[PDB]
Amino acid sequence: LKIVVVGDGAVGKTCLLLAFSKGEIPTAYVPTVFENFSHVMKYKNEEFILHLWDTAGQEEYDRLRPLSYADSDVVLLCFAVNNRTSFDNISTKWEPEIKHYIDTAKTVLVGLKVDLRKDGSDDVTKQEGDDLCQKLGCVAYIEASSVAKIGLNEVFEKSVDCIF
Amino acid sequence: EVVQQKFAIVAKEMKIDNPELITIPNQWKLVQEYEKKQKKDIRIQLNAQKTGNWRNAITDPKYLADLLKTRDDMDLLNEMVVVFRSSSVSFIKTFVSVGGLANLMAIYKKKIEAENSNTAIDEERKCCEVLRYVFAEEDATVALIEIDGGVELLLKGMNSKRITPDNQLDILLEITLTSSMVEHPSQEGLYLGGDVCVMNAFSNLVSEGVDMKKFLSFFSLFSKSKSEKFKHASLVLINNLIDQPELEHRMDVRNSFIEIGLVNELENMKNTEWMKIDKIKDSINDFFDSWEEDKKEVESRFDDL
Ligand SMILES: Nc1nc2c(ncn2[C@@H]2O[C@H](COP(=O)(O)OP(=O)(O)OP(O)(O)=S)[C@@H](O)[C@H]2O)c(=O)[nH]1
Ligand SMILES: [Mg+2]
């Protein structure tokens, strides 16, 4: 099972991956360039092989991110719920990109940093993500926090489900 | 499988200045993927000739170039954004080398002049967005200099009320790059005269009757703009245009700028928070320092007559 993670700079992709499988945070924020490791996950009465491909949110690495897409079964389209701008970029930058390079992949829409969602604020809602999930044809929208340890397993259990 | 220079190819191909940030084991993975994709791209093209998903067929730069002679639509424009933003250096080099830019420029003219509608602003803006990716390649700026009315078209496009402050910046950055490209950047002794190219385009706006005075619309963009990237970039262009080898030609270009309010504009910026930025403080100082040396020189010649 090949899973690739895309989204804007600083929305919490690295943290998402390392919390799911460590499960903690790197303390020091270092912008991703490329990262790739496998990791075994116990789900049902069997173990699974998860090949994780972390990518760069930053524009500087645009001509290189496609090197991560080949043969991807699932792509995680990530934004941060307290960052509408990252949310908008899913449909202008991220989806169009993976649809161009690896249209055979299933997509999971992932709302990151839910722990930080204030109210009265212009943040993204579970409603908006669910709706986008519908327009984009993702398998599911799943909210998560690497900091409060929420949805982590959920996110990666789904990546497996949509493959069985 | 220890070398490991076989990556410096992928590196410059993807525009990566610091590969030292990649763990050796990773840039082997990346090499296998690079090679794998070169093979993948090949298969899709020979295949989409019949499928026929043009979306995959235009991953041939030559094919993309030829298609623009016939297609100018949102779909194609959107796909081109993806392609040019995320492709390899050499994919653009090839596109440009086979026409490509002149073809995209023609479409851009059509878009700039199209009658107003809802789809009009967007169609024009995608164009800017696509051009902004071709121009990240030097060969593209070389190609632009040789297109009749290319720089002029950029100047006109830059004055469109249909585009965004960011669009206007990207075009300016492309004009400025052109203005400084006297010689081919990657060929020893090959004159290109981009400096003269841009100068003429500014003279042509005057003589086609679009600028009431030389430099007016550019200068007026510069004047109200609030980007600070744009103030700086505008200063760089101005100083480049004034930076001429002959005193006669500096005294002349700078006079045109004096004639339209430049001096009073900079002096207002000196009494302003603008000086807090070193890129801009130095450009403004350069202007005055060069204006003063020229006064002394002029005085000095008069003194000998
Ligand atoms: N409050 C909160 N902060 C988070 C969460 N996840 C990541 N962050 C913070 O946001 C910053 C970005 O996290 P990170 O995972 O490294 O972003 P990224 O998506 O990988 O960014 P890039 O590599 O594409 S540039 C980090 O400093 C981290 O502390 C989260 O779930 N909750
Ligand atoms: Mg990261």
Walk me through the domains of chain B, giving residue ranges and CATH numbers: 1-305 (1.25.10.10)
Pairs across A and B, CB distance < 8 A = 47
* Residue A53: burial class (beta carbons within 10 Å; 0-12, 13-18, 19+): buried
> E strands, B185-246, where?
none
Q: Output b/e per residue, B25-54; b: 16+ Cβ within 10 A.
A: ebbbbbbebbeebeebbeebbeebeeeeee
Torsions phi, psi for A145 (to 5 deg)? -130, 125
Structure tokens at B164: 């965004």
CA of B55: which chain A residue's CA is closest?
Answer: A100
Per the CB < 8 A criterion, the answer to whether B191 and B182 are in contact is yes
| Residue located via tokens 């005055």 | B288
State the nearest Cα–Cα gap between B74 and chain A, in angstroms. 13
Closest residue by Cα to residue A155 from A50, A60, A37, A65: A50
By a Cβ cutoff of 8 Å, what residues of chain B touch chain A?
10, 13-16, 21-22, 26, 29-30, 33-34, 36-37, 40, 55, 78-79, 81-83, 85-89
Which of B14, A16, A20, A18 shows the shortest CA–CA distance to B22? Answer: B14
Nearest-CA residue for atom 13 of ligand 1: A12
Backbone dihedral angles phi then psi of residue A77, each to the nearest 5 degrees: -85, 110
HSE at residue A113, side-chain half, CA atoms within 13 A, is 19
Cβ-contact B137, B89 below 8 angstroms: yes
In sequence order, what E strands does A8-161 have? 34-43, 46-55, 74-80, 106-112, 140-143
Q: Tokens representing B141? A: 């700026």
Residue identified by tokens 């700028």 is: B257
Here the contacts of B214-219 (C-beta below 8 Å, separation 24 or greater) are B214/B256, B214/B260, B215/B256, B215/B257, B215/B260, B216/B260, B217/B155, B217/B159, B218/B155, B218/B158, B219/B257, B219/B260, B219/B261, B219/B262, B219/B265
- Sequence positions preceding breaks in chain A, C–N over 2.5 Å: none
Written as six digits, the tokens of B173 are 């950055």
Instruction: State the pairing for strand pair A34-43/A46-55.
Output: antiparallel
What are the pocket residues of ligand 1 if the criterion is a CB atom closer than 6 Å to any ligand atom? A 9-15, 29, 31-32, 56-58, 112-113, 115-116, 145-147
Two tokens, residue B18:
């610091």
The residue of chain B nearest to residue A62, with distances taken between CA atoms, is: B86
User: Up-side HSE of residue B133: CA atoms within 13 Å toward CB?
Assistant: 27
First to last CA, chain A: 11
**CATH number of the domain that A156 lies in?**
3.40.50.300
Six token digits for residue B180: 């400084």
Cβ neighbors of B248 (< 8 A, separation 6 or more) are: none
Alpha-carbon span B118 to B121, nearest angstrom: 6
**In contact, B9 and B19? CB cutoff 8 Å:** no
3-state secondary structure of B193: coil
Q: How far apart are CA A86 and CA B123, in angstroms?
A: 23
Q: Does an H or E element contain B298, and which? A: helix B278-302
Q: For strand A74-80 and strand A2-7, is the pairing parallel, antiparallel, or unpaired? A: parallel
Give strand ranges (E) for B82-176. Answer: none
Domain span holding position A25: 1-164
Q: What is d(CA B218, CA B214) in angstroms, rounded to the nearest whole number?
A: 9
Q: Which ligand has an atom closest to residue A65 CA? A: 1
Counting ligand 1 atoms within 8 A of each CB, the residue from A79, A83, A146, A152 with the most, and so the one to mutate, is A146
- Give the integer Cα–Cα distance in Å for B303 and A7: 67
Strand A74-80 relative to strand A46-55, pairing: unpaired
Inspect the interface and report whether the beta carbons of B14 and A64 lie closer than 8 Å.
yes
d(CA B254, CA B182): 20
Experiment type: X-ray
The total of structural domains in chain A comes to 1
Q: Which two tokens stand for residue A38?
A: 């496998």
Closest CA of chain B from A93, distance in Å: 8
Q: How far apart are CA B124 and CA B112, in angstroms?
A: 6
Q: Is B6 in contact with B19 (CB distance < 8 Å)?
A: no
CB of B255 within 8 A of CB of B206? no
What whole-number distance in Å separates Cα of residue B15 and Cα of residue A61?
Answer: 8
* B271 CA → ligand 1 middle, Å: 41
Can you tell me the distance from the alpha carbon of A137 to that of A162, in angstroms, rounded to the nearest whole number? Answer: 13
